[PDB]
Structures are given as structure tokens and as C-alpha cells.
Design a protein around this motif. Sequence first.
Motif, PDB file in Angstrom:
ATOM      1  N   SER A   1      -8.286  19.072  20.733  1.00 47.11           N
ATOM      2  CA  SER A   1      -9.002  19.161  19.464  1.00 47.11           C
ATOM      3  C   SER A   1      -8.264  20.059  18.478  1.00 47.11           C
ATOM      4  O   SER A   1      -8.068  19.693  17.312  1.00 47.11           O
TER       5      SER A   1
ATOM      6  N   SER B   1      -9.552  19.680  26.582  1.00 48.61           N
ATOM      7  CA  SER B   1     -10.240  19.116  25.425  1.00 48.61           C
ATOM      8  C   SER B   1     -10.147  20.047  24.224  1.00 48.61           C
ATOM      9  O   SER B   1      -9.918  19.594  23.094  1.00 48.61           O
TER      10      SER B   1
ATOM     11  N   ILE C   1     -12.184  12.024  26.908  1.00 51.70           N
ATOM     12  CA  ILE C   1     -12.246  13.157  25.986  1.00 51.70           C
ATOM     13  C   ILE C   1     -11.746  12.797  24.596  1.00 51.70           C
ATOM     14  O   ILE C   1     -11.969  13.570  23.651  1.00 51.70           O
TER      15      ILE C   1
ATOM     16  N   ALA D   1     -17.372  17.992  24.973  1.00 56.22           N
ATOM     17  CA  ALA D   1     -16.541  17.831  26.162  1.00 56.22           C
ATOM     18  C   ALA D   1     -17.350  18.039  27.437  1.00 56.22           C
ATOM     19  O   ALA D   1     -17.151  17.327  28.428  1.00 56.22           O
TER      20      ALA D   1
ATOM     21  N   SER E   1      -9.407  11.214  32.369  1.00 53.29           N
ATOM     22  CA  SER E   1      -9.957  12.338  31.619  1.00 53.29           C
ATOM     23  C   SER E   1      -9.645  12.218  30.132  1.00 53.29           C
ATOM     24  O   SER E   1     -10.518  12.450  29.287  1.00 53.29           O
TER      25      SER E   1
ATOM     26  N   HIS F   1     -10.694  21.129  32.619  1.00 50.96           N
ATOM     27  CA  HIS F   1     -11.021  19.965  31.808  1.00 50.96           C
ATOM     28  C   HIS F   1     -11.595  20.320  30.446  1.00 50.96           C
ATOM     29  O   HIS F   1     -11.429  19.548  29.500  1.00 50.96           O
TER      30      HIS F   1
END
Lengths: 310, 391, 104, 482, 478
Positions: free
Chosen positions: E82, E78, E142, E35, E138, E74
Motif C-alpha cells: 500500500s 500489505s 491483498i 488486510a 496472498s 502477511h
Amino acid sequence: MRNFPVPYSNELIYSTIARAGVYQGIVSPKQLLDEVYGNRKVVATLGLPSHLGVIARHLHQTGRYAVQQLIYEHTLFPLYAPFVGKERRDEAIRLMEYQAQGAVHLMLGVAASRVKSDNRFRYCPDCVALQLNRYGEAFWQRDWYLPALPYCPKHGALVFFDRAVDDHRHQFWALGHTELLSDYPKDSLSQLTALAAYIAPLLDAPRAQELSPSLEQWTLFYQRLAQDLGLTKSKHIRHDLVAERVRQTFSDEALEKLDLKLAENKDTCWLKSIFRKHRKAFSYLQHSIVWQALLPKLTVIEALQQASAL
Amino acid sequence: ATRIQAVYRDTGVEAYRDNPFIEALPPLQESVNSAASLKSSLQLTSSDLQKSRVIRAHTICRIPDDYFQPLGTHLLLSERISVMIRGGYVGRNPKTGDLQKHLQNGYERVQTGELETFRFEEARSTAQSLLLIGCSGSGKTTSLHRILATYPQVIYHRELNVEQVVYLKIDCSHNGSLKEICLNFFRALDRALGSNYERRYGLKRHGIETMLALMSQIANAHALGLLVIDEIQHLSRSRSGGSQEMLNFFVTMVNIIGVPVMLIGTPKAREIFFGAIFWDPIQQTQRGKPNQEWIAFTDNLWQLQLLQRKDALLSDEVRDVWYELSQGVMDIVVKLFVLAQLRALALGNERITAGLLRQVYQDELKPVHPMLEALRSGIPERIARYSDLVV
Amino acid sequence: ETMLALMSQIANAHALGLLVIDEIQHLSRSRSGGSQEMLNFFVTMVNIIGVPVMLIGTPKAREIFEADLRSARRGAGFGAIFWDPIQQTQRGKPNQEWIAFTDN
Amino acid sequence: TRIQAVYRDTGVEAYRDNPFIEALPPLQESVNSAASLKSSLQLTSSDLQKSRVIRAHTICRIPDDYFQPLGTHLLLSERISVMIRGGYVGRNPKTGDLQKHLQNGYERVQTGELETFRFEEARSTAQSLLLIGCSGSGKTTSLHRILATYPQVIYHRELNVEQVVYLKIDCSHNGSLKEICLNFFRALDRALGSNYERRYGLKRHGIETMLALMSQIANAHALGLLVIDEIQHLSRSRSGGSQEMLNFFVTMVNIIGVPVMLIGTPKAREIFEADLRSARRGAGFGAIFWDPIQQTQRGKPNQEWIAFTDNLWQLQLLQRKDALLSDEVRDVWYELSQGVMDIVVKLFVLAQLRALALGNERITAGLLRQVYQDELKPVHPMLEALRSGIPERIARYSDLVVPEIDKRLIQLQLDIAAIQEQTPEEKALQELDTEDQRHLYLMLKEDYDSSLLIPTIKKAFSQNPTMTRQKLLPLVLQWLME
Amino acid sequence: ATRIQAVYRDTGVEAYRDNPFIEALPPLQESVNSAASLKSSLQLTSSDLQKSRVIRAHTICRIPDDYFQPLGTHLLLSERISVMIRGGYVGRNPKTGDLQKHLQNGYERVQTGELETFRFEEQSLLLIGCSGSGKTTSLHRILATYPQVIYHRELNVEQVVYLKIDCSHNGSLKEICLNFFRALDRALGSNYERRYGLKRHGIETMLALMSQIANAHALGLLVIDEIQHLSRSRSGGSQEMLNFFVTMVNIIGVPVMLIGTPKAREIFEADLRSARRGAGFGAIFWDPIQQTQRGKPNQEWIAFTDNLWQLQLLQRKDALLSDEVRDVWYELSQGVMDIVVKLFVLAQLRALALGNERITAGLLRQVYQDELKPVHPMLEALRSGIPERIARYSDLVVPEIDKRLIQLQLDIAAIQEQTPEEKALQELDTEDQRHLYLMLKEDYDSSLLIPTIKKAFSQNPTMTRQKLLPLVLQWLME
DNA sequence: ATACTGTGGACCAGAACCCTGATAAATGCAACGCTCATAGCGGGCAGACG
DNA sequence: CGTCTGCCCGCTATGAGCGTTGCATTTATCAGGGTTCTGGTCCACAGTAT
Ligand SMILES: Nc1ncnc2c1ncn2[C@@H]1O[C@H](COP(=O)(O)OP(=O)(O)OP(=O)(O)O)[C@@H](O)[C@H]1O
Ligand SMILES: Nc1ncnc2c1ncn2[C@@H]1O[C@H](COP(=O)(O)OP(=O)(O)O)[C@@H](O)[C@H]1O
Ligand SMILES: Nc1ncnc2c1ncn2[C@@H]1O[C@H](COP(=O)(O)OP(=O)(O)O)[C@@H](O)[C@H]1O
Ligand SMILES: [Mg+2]
Ligand SMILES: [Mg+2]
Ligand SMILES: [Mg+2]
Ligand SMILES: [Zn+2]
């Protein structure tokens, strides 16, 4: 809607909606609300109308008509605008574009009239004939529907008749030709007509929106005018000299007809509160009466500009 | 549905000085060049004659749809339509306040229910009416449609907000009921406009006077100029007592409301029934000579050929055979010519002739032989028999 | 008329190409209004935009679509097509198509 | 979630042939009935050396996955078992050919052989109970955890009926006398797969109509419990008064059986106490009171508090951790959390989260102090009310909790994430105190050496401080790189 | 259709062991820095600035595309995505029986069989933030580390790791319900909507069809974006607005993310105002970059501004930022990522043509009060700080940006006049020895320098540059 | 040169509306039933042969 | 003088257009606690007779 009428000069948008209903043969008010706005939850009001912007979308292809033009030239907002303040005025302007109905009435403390003050429909003896000769139609003019003065600035007095806004709600009603003043004379007071003529120039002025004095400057303006006229001795009101000055122009009966009866015997009064430090915005009538009684050689625009500048 | 922002003109007549509606229209063409304006023909070109078979056969069938020829009556119809659509705007001026009196009255008609009410005494209506009846197979449904193609129908004004529709064409229902004209009118006035008038004015459980005055008022909310109705013959098949109601409503609307109305119907519609104009199929002989109009029509239809072989000049025998097989009706000439070409290309002979025309007619117009033979015989009894025969 | 007008909207929403009607012979003449009613209904389909149609029937159903010039004109259009039984001898020699069909 | 039904014989003889009770889990021998409630997240030793983001995520996840079974949960579990598996006597479907038995009894009672016989089956004694306690003591999670042991749906193959053992309802923030009725439909249409809300829960019907349809819905199935939770949120101004609420809540007679349980803060305790009959029937059989845990109830300090503190302390995840717990830390936990279950766990979580942010990487009592006066403003009235101990102030201020604390946790996690980024390359730049020599720094080393140019310019400036930028440049080559 | 043959790798988490759908994903060890590896820079050589103005303008106009600075808001997103995807495959394990069978076995064992007990216990998220904060861009990058389609050979099952949906203007629920199959068929290439998505089916039936294909096909993440564009009145009231999303989340069973504006937060106020961790709908807020952090200036702002400041291409630029030029950005832009870089890129283009080739604070006022007009209500609402005005004046996105970009790229053509700097550059032969000229502009006047460098480069001692730079300076000084 | 009196500004507390929830009731609106029109039908009547 | 086989016509059946009508549907009506409005209050203070 497809063919929305363009408002005439000095016409409430309520009468434009009513004439739109007349033109395309819609009789049931629910259909009229379905086609003009799209919803059946809009309250019909005279002065400070709500749900504006929808009325402008139907006039989109005519670029000259927008929210600001309709709100300064086809409503009763310019009378309430310069006196309420700056932030409140701007927020009211920005809020009348949205779907708020009672918020517009309730936000302005001066406009919080609660119960309607003789909300029935009015017209004029000679204005209708002039409109028919010039336009071929009749509409609820902005001059007729003064908030508290039942007096045309050019004519003697209005002529009330039946029906009221609070009685039937969802109906936009427009005078046609089947009803008109039957021949009888209505008594008119010259002082009230002069006051109406003096105050009427406020609804048509390019700088009537910018010339908004703040809350603090009003008391300073009153003290400055009292000092230059020399009425006050030392931060004091005579309680008789100012009353005589007001009485030199307006009698007791004329003020009673305006519900602004003087209460010089009692400490609390509208003039006394004007003399004191202001709390909330006052009506146009009180300011106009005070300005005209205390200075008779000036008009609305110059007096308001002088109050705002210093 | 061609929305145009109108640009105004300055006509030379003082009766038409300040209207926006009638300034917005294109000018009246001179009849010297109006005939050339209407003329359209296939673009042809010589590159097709050296091409394959089916491609060449396809574009021949476009002749009946792409070919038009002006005649003597076309100029008269154009002038009459221009006059009748220019006379219908002198009483509905919106600039000086005359439409607002023709439209305030239309609301008390809806409220009360009667079409004869009147609130303003000075509200005058200037409108005309005209019926156009001609023998079937003359073009009175495409000639009118080509005359009314100069006017762009919907045109939008700027100072006002009126979206003036110049003309509107509707069809009478086969049932002939009272509640069908006032419905296909609302369908034709929102097909060409993009709105939904039918969902307002027709869905509800309304009466007949209400929905007969609502149409007359919504035809003046937009400054409609000419309401033309085709296939007027359908009213004779309606229920008892309903034939005269339209015959009074389409003369009240012309007189009271002020919307000009033009009615076109088949020859059978004289008995059921303003001006009167009658059309006739072309006749090659006026007094004692073949006529210039017929000669020019045939000589110009000649060049629309894609046969690989042909002849330079037409023969009088072939002309007479064509006239005998057609009996003067307009559509059958073009139909016979295109069918004869199609049969010649199918057979493999690249030339057209009188026997070919005869065999093409006999083998490919089987529904049409009875009444064509009747026309060829010309017996007055047989002409009076059946319907919509020329007389 | 309402459904026939909805037909135009449906046939203009999707670009319909050819609307063929068959088994006209299976129509009862007493449950619709009459022969004139059949004729007027099938001529009323001129208002529907484009969408060319083709009519199918038996030679005893030809009598309805006749004796009226406009109805006959719309019936004809691109000529007339008449299916017929294979006759053995069009010319002096018997037709080759009958021989080929029988052998195949 | 329809689990197939299998039956097992029970010791009690009052349910010898009742299917709706034998289709349930066996009666809990109260030696480890609440031992399975004990939950603790793994905290493997390998998770200590890990990135700050994942550790912060685990710290935020602590409150959900931690549940310490106290010694007072045993009584609640026993009560729930009793009044769930005791209210099924009157809803028994195991009825044989009763036509012949009733006919024989009718024949024999009239001929004089027998003089009396009971013919009535309308035998259903409804049970009701309040659960009253201060907010934040865990009246919802410590009920869902207990009630998750019993299957919600059990399907009988021989019959075509289901036993909805528990049905959970929560009121809205404003609340009304109709929202609970609609929420019953909403919750039962989510428990099973059906369309009861649209079929019965219609707008046109009145409140009594939905209350009566509740009887049919809950008696068609073998419903066993009906938890209406958080009645504190009910708006008295939008309800209608402080009496018709009682008159509606004591109208649980018309729903047959269905032992209803209500949970609320003591603000509603004064509401539900105005007369004998409502006090009898709203709380039919006792009313368990939840009180904040104390350090000591007897002379010796309570061992439950010590065990809870030790278990929560062992769950700590930090690089620098002290195994020994000083008694001052326990003292400040009690003095600042007064035993309220919600307050102590959130205080510990915020302290552990802020330890990462400040970088001290250790938990101290003083750190607990500034997090207390920093992030716990709206919970103060609870705190001084419990410190003073006045029942009036406690009852006046027992409905308040810290709002949007999850957003504060997310903000703290975002701050920790943003803090982390450090650049060893920027360490070289950080010794550049002067500034405006950054001009030469930027223009020079873009195409030139980047190794010793940055440090040596510091020496050049310090050794020659009576100088500006311009003529520092011409000899930079020979003095520094060469 | 990006098909990669599935390979199996060992994951240290014991929960994901022996689940064939999980280990096909990229491992966790190399995904920690993945990321943070999305940082991108449009790096250029100093010789690129020497080229024509059109070339540098065309390189600059690509900044709103290739520039991406990760922040603290940010990395967390991510990590959350995940974890949420990886935790959504613990149920559908083809090597293990269905959870219904496991529950039945547990009930059998808590019955007469000797065991203590068994727990009969059984995570949608929404991303609401200020419009123009950089959400869709974004997420699009990602989600690049995860291959979209992973094909299994031991079984016959295509694992659609993630799918993405996008709404349209004034759309309804049916449009998204069909766009899901449109995206699925863009992913696999089959005809999953040619016969399963007919107009005949209603909403309940269509969702019932959705659930079975979402469960049979291995699907992990379903993201619906730009929900603000969905029309409310066309669908109806706000009650069924929430009901449709609730029944979409509940029946499918896969993790689902929603992204929109605070104008949807009032729609989703129910089920979110009350803390419901069991129901889901956890909220993550994005806010504009706060310049002031606890009475101190934010480090992320002064790092992003520095990185954005080092990549400006101008002739006579002032290379160092002042406090006032940085301060006026937060007053004219309020920090939302949509218009900060927009203001910078428009300012550079206007400085290219208007006047002196340097960036000052004054020209930013010209840009803001001339061309960045329509989003003034949002800026006023943000300046006031009133949440009501911020929420109710969202959803405006200043359209027709592409036409503005192409017209500003074209408009620079009509400049016949030459500023003395570039005319001196052109009259000088372009041997690209002008790196010294650009380096040493301030210290000495051009009149002394450029004729002298012409004379020196007429007979340079050696061809070498930047090793032979000092000698020219020694001739330059005297 | 100061105590007394009127006065300006900041300020408690009663009350009048007012939004809201629950409940009862007038009502347009498609939903069938009526009626008119039209084509066939099968047993009764004039009729005529055994 | 019976009766037996074809006609027809008052019927029988059914399509098309319009006229009531059950129905939620929507509207209207009434009890109630709260919150700003407003009313007087008072407390320090400016100007003044002693
Ligand atoms: N003057 C003409 N010039 C060229 N073609 C013509 C002319 N008159 C008629 N036609 C052709 O004959 C046909 C006339 O069209 P259409 O069938 O609508 O006419 P109609 O029989 O008069 O109309 P209606 O449908 O009103 O009875 C078209 O194919 C047209 O091309
Ligand atoms: N025995 C316990 N062990 C751990 N945490 C608990 C326990 N009891 C309650 N909690 C905490 O209480 C919180 C839930 O409180 P909640 O159910 O909202 O209170 P209420 O029931 O009054 O609304 C959870 O976050 C949980 O961490
Ligand atoms: N991390 C970032 N760094 C720099 N610029 C960014 C970043 N994220 C977004 N942007 C800029 O924001 C602009 C608009 O973003 P956009 O994709 O519209 O976000 P959203 O879809 O959430 O409104 C893009 O031109 C992009 O250059
Ligand atoms: Mg025609
Ligand atoms: Mg609770
Ligand atoms: Mg986006
Ligand atoms: Zn007047």
C-alpha cells in the motif's frame, strides 16, 4: 542425442560415451561434448565420472537405467562406498548427479589422489577375444581399471600402452580392433592375482551399498579380531608377530609393486595406523590386505557384514 | 513421425528368427486380399444429391485425390518391395552383434576419408537395388506412396534404443550438384524424426568424401530399410564429370554399406544410366478384346458421380471416346472426367456425354493438346520427339 | 536449393494457402541460366508441401511452359484460363457484356 | 538529467570568461554552505497515536532521513568546492580566433621586435586527495549529501558539450584491478544516456587500454571530480600485490585534469604509504582524517555531541516519552558507542524498536545494555580496540561492520507485527484452565447460548471440584441458564 | 475492465494533496483493517456433518481454496505494498508542471536570483522465499481492495492502478516483455499489442516502447511473479539476466515488485549484497512457520493449528489435539504452508475410507511415506538446515494435484460396507434429532440410546429441539 | 606395593599445490574474391556497287 | 579502284558455385598468496621392575 547406446554388463560409462561417438560419426571432441552434454566444459575421467544424469536423460525411455543403477554398476564408486562412511557416501552419491567435477574427486579423502597413479589405458590378453566373440566390440571394462592393481582377477596381468588421460583431456577413446596384444608373455605374481580375485567380488553385490560401517566401529573391529586371534598382550602391537603374519601371505617385492611397502623398522606405517584409532577413510587395498593376512577363511561380503554389525 | 513402441512377432522363416528390426514390421499380406487392401474410394452417400450447388461442386474436385484403383503390377510391386525390404535386415542383426560391425567400420571411413576401407572381414552386407521407370502419368509417385503406407516409418524399440526408420524418400536437386543429395537426405531424416542432423553435418565447412560417408554412417546408426529416390532425371543437367559419381555411389552404397536403394525416374533417364522394371499406360485391347482391367476401372469410376441426372449403363461409344481422348495415360482419364463434370454442372445440363467430353477437353486442356495429339497420331518420329513419351 | 528448402519450412510454420506469382514476363532470360533452367526451377516447387501456386504471364511466355509432359501437366492443373479481349459479335447479335460495359 | 546552462559573473578574476565554471552554482559564501545539509523527518504530533506497524516503519526509516551536519563538514565542503572549481583552468573552451594571435606572435618574435612569447596551452595541474577514517563514520552518505548540491549534467546551447561535475564509483566486495575500470563505464552510462560501456569497455582490452580510454572519455566532457570510494574491499590476493595497487593508483597522471578523490579505512592507509612519490601524489593537497567524536576536546564537554544527542532524542516516537534526558543516558551512549556515528544511531533505533516489542514503552539505560549484548556481536573488535586505544589493534580491526542488520530489523518488525493480535473473545476462553471441559464447551454452545455459558462453567467446576465431565452436563441448563 | 467513476476524497497526508491520481484510491482509514479482513472460514452447521460422506468430502476438498489465515508476515506485506503504490504517484501530478521544469526553475533561482540553494536530487522490491509459502495467493487477494482501472472524466486518462504478470516454463525475457502488453490489454480491452508487439522489434526498442506507454497511462504497480520458471541458459549468462531487470526498473520509473525463489537470489546477489538504498532492491524474506520461537512454541502456529483443527468433519473424531500429533507435522512437513494443509486434507480423506473415523499421528506417516513423495529432497534440505541445500533443491511444486483430487473424490464410491455408526443413522429416520446422538456418544452405549430415542420420537411431547433437549436426557438416563 | 618406559590421542607449524588474475598467442568461421559458364554486342573485315 | 552497310566473334558483362582470409575468438601460459596436508610433537597415561 537420439540413439544413445545402452551400456553392456561391467562397462564404464566412459566407454559408452566413446562408442556413442564412434557410432554416429563424430570425430571432433568438441562436437561430441556439444551433443552428449550440451557444454564444452566437461572433463573426461575414468572412475567417479561427473555430470551424470545427463547420460540418464538420453536413456529415459528405458526405465531400468537411472542414476543409482549407473552409479553402482557402471562406475568405480562401489569400491570407495562402504569404507568412506555413511554421510560422506550419501553426499557423494547425491553430488555426482549434479554438475560438480572436482568436488567428487576432492570430497572423499580416500579419493583425493591428487596426481594420477599411472592413468594410462590398459586391457587384457584374453578378455578382448572373449568380448569380441560374445559382443563384437571392445570396451574399457571395470575389472581392468582397478585403482592400484594392474591385474585382471581372472587373468595374469594387464598390458599397458601409450597415451594418458592427462595428456589429451576432452577425448573419449575406445579400443576397436586395429590394436591388440602382440605375442609376448608378461610375468605375473600369483599372490597379486589372488588378491585381485579376492577383492573383485565387491563391485557386484546387492548389499554392497548398505554395508557401510561408521568411523568409530573400525578400531573396535580391529581390537576384537586381535583379541580373538590373541596377538595383542594388553592394548599392544607386537611389531614383529603381525609383520610375520602379513609376510606369510605377501612378500616384500609384491608389496613394493603395489607401493604398499612395509616399514616395520619405523614407527609410522599404514598397518600401525590401522591398529591405532582411525582418522580418515583408508583405501580398499589396505583393508583387504589386513583382512586377508589376519583371517584367510572368509570373503569380502561376510567380513564386511561382521565388521558392520558389531 | 508416428513413434510406436514395437511389439514383436514370430515369423515362420528360420532366417528371420531373432531380429527385433524385422520382427517389428507388420506381416506380408496375401496377394489375394492385398488388392482389396489398397482399394479406397469416395464415401459418396446419397444426401449430397439433394443439397445446394457450390457445396456439391466442391466435393467433386476431391475425386483425383481420394480415388485409387489397384492393377496387376501393383501386387508385383508390393511383393518386390516386401522382399527387397526384408532382405536388407538379414545382415544387420543387433541382437547377435552384426550391426556393431557394420557400424564400427563406418567410423574409419569417416576418419580416413575413403569409402572402401574395411576393418572387420566378416562384415557382410545383403542388400538389393531396383529401378522403376514408367511413362509419365502412371502413378509411380502416389502408387509407391500408397504401397509404403502400411509400414509406419519410424518405429521405436524397447530393449535397444534404436529408432528404426523403415523407409525414407528424397528428391534429387535440379542443379544435380554433389552437395545437395547429402543435404536433402539430412533434411528428410530430421523432418520425420524431430532432430537436427543438418545443423551438425551440413553447416560446417566439410569436404565431399566426408559428407558422403557421414550420410552412409548415419543411415546405419538408425536401421534404415529403404532409401527411395524420385526424379532421378535431374542428374543429367549437372556439371561435367558429376553424372557418373552418383552412378557409382548408389551402387557402392547398395553393395558395401548395405542400405537398399530404389530409384524412380522418367523415361528420359534410360540414357544416363541392379534390376529393371518398366511400366506402361493402360491399353484397353490386349489381343482383340477390351480388357477386364480397363472395363472395371471405367465401371467403378462411373459411380463417382454427383450429377442430378445420369444413365444406368455406359455405352461403347462413350468408352471409345474416353479412350481416344486419353490415349491410355492414367492421370488424364481422371482429369478429363472431373473437368467434364465441372463443365456440366457449370453449364446447367445434368448429364454427361461424348460431345460434352470433347468440348471439355478442347476448352480446358490447352497446354496439353500438342502432345495428346502427338500420342493420338502415334507417329514414331513424333514419339521420339520431345521427352518422356511412351515407347 | 537452400532457400527453396527454407521456403518449405516457412510455408509449413504458417499454413500458407495460395502463393501467386505474377509478372513472369518481366524475367530476363540471360541472367538465370536459360529456358530449361526456368522450367526446372518452376517444376522444383513440387517438393514444397501443399501451398498451391498460380502462374501469370503473357502469351509469349507460354512457350517456356510447353513441350515437356511433366512441365505442361503441372502448368495445366485445373485446366487452362485464357483472358482475351472482348470480341463484339460472338453470336450474330453483338455481345451484351460489351454493350453493358460501354454504356456503364 | 541535462539542465540548461545560464551564466553568472564571479568575483574571482581567474575565471573572468571561463564558461565551465560560470555554468555552475555560485561560489558558496561559507555562512550557510552546510546549513542546507541539515535534515530531520517531520515527526508531527498527530503521529503519536498510530498503529504499531506504521510507527515501526517510521522507526526503520529514521536512519535514512536523518543527517546531522557537524562542524567538520564545512572543511570538507570547502575543499570539494576548491578542487572542483579550481581544476577547470586548463580545460577552458572559451578560445577565440587564436590562429591570428599565434601567427602575429610568430611573426613578431622572429623580426626582433619581441624576444619571447609563450605558445603552449598544455597547462593542467591535477589534484588528488585521500579521505581516511574509521569505517562507520559516514564517509559515503556525508559525501553524497554534499555533492548533490552540484548538478551532475549541464548542457550548453551554443556548444555541444556537457560538464559531468561529479561521477561516483564504488568497488565490489571482492574487487579487482579491472572492476573499477569497468565500473567507470557502468556509472557514466547511467549518469548520461549513451552506450559507452559496450563501445569502449570491452573484454579484449588491457588495463592500460581502459585507463587510456578514460582520458579521452573524461576530456571529451568537462568532468570535474572522480570519486572512487571503498577501496578497502579490494582483495589484495586477487589484486596482484601490495605494490602494483599503488603503481596503478598513482597512474592518474595520464588522465588530464580530473581531480580524483579516494576514500578508505586506515587498513589501506598503511598500503598507500611506502615511498615519497606516492605519498605526495596520491594525497596531493592534505588528507582529511575522520575521527570518532569525543565527549570533550577542551575542558568543557563538546557542545556538538550535546546538540546531536538532543536532536536525536527529540525525534523519538513513543506513547510514553520522557522529555527530560538524564545525564546517565548520555554517559551510557558514550561508553557503549564511543562516538562512532554509525553505532549510536543504530543502537538508538534498535532500542526504540525493541521498546515496542517488550511493551515497556520506555527507553532505559539497562535496555540499551541488553540490546548491546544481544544484537551487536560482530562489531565487538571495534569496541575493545577503541576502548584500549592501541593503534595496531584498531588498524587490524577497522574493516568490520555488523552484517545483514537490515534483515534483523525486518525480523524484529515481523515479530512486532505478529505480537499485536489479541482477541477479546479469547479473553473469555482464557479463564478455562482445566481443559478437556473444552469438549462440552465446543459441543454445547455451537447452537446454544454463548453469553454466560463460558463463565458459569468455571463456577460449576470450582464449586464441585470432586467431579468429572460426564454428569456435570445434565443439570447445566437449570443451574446456569435458567 | 472493472471501470469505476473516479471520486475524490481528502487524505490527511499533505504530500498527496491535489494529485488527481491518488485520491481515487480507497482511503487509508478503512484500509487499516482491510488486510486483516481477508480472514476466511468455511463455516458449517453441525447438521452438515449428519449428511452423506460424499457431501462432507466435497466440502473438505475446498479447504485448500477457501482457507486463509493471516499471520505477522502477511499484514506487513500489505502495508508495504500500500505504501509503495501510494508513494509512486508523487511525481506524475497532472496539476503541476514536470519535474524537469521545476529543476530548471530551481537552478534559475539558485543562480543570480536571491535564494540560498536548491537540491538537485532525484524503489524496486523483491519477494524471495521458500517455494510454497503462499506468495501468489496472498498477493492476489491483498490487491483486491484496489480497483484495477479507475476512469477519470475531467481528463481523458485511464488509471491502471496495478497490473500482474505471470511467467511460463522455460521462458525468456521476450515472453515477459510481451506478456506485459497481454496483461495490459486484458485489463483495458484495447489492441495495445496487435501492432506494438511485433516480432521485428528488439529488446531495447521493445522496452523503449514499454516505458512511454507506462508513463502516459497512469500505472502504479507492476508485479512479475514466478520468475523461478524462467530458463537461464536460454536467455544466457546471469550478467545480462540482472542487466535486463536493472534497465527495466530504471527506465520505466514506476514501483516494481518481483517474486521468486532463493534460486533467483544468487542472480540478484549483485546490487543487493552491498547496502544500496538509493538503487533500491530492498529484500523481504519469507520463511516457514517456526514452531519453536526463542525456546518457546510459536503463538501463530498454535492459533493456526487450532483454527484448522476446529474445522474437521468426522464421525468418531477425537476433537482435541495432543502434543505428539502437532509435533509430527513439523517433522513430516517442516512448516511450509504448501504441504501442511495438504497433509491435513489428505489425512482426512484417507481416514474417511481406510478405517476408524478419527485422525491419529500414525496415518500421517502413511500419507507422507506413500503419496507426498517428490518433495523429499526439499524436506531433507529443510531438516538439515543447510542454506545451500535449501536453495539448490527449490522450484519443485509436486504437479498433477488436480488429477489426484478428482481421483480421491471418485475413489470413495466403491465402499459397499457400512460402519455401524452411519448404518444406525440410516436405519433411524432422518428427522435430524441426532444432534443429541452425536453430542452424547461417549457417555452411554448406542444400544441403550438409539432404540430409546426411536421410542421417544415416536411420541415426542413437543416438536421443539434444543429447548426440549434435556427432557429426552431425563428419559435417556432412566 | 611405586618410578620408569613405551604408547595412544590431541595438537603447532612448515610446505606443496592450487585457484586466480593478467597477458600473449593459435585458430575456425563466415566474408569476400576466383573462376567457370553463358548470353549478348559493336566495331573490324570480307564483300560488292558507284 | 574506294566505301558503306550487314555479320560475327573475340570480347564484355554477369550469375552461380567454390577457395582463400581478416577476424575477434577462444585458448594457452605464467606469476602469486593462501589453505589444508602432513609431519613430528608432547603430554598424560597403562603396564611394569624395584
Ligand atoms: N491406378 C490408379 N488408380 C487411380 N488413380 C490413379 C492411378 N494411377 C494414377 N492415378 C492418378 O493419376 C495421378 C498420378 O499421380 P502423379 O502425378 O504423381 O503420377 P506420375 O505422373 O506417375 O508421377 P511423376 O510425378 O513421378 O511423373 C494422381 O492424380 C492419381 O490419383
Ligand atoms: N551526520 C550524520 N547524521 C546522521 N547519520 C549519519 C551521519 N553520518 C553518517 N550517518 C550514518 O551512517 C550510515 C552510512 O554509513 P556508510 O556511508 O556506510 O559508511 P562508509 O562511508 O564508511 O561506508 C547511515 O546509515 C547514516 O545513518
Ligand atoms: N494464509 C493461508 N492460510 C491457509 N492456507 C494457505 C494460506 N496461504 C496459502 N495457503 C495454501 O497453500 C496452497 C498453495 O499455495 P500457492 O498459491 O501454491 O503459494 P505459492 O504460489 O507461493 O507457491 C494453497 O492450496 C492454499 O490453500
Ligand atoms: Mg513424381
Ligand atoms: Mg565506506
Ligand atoms: Mg503461485
Ligand atoms: Zn582380463
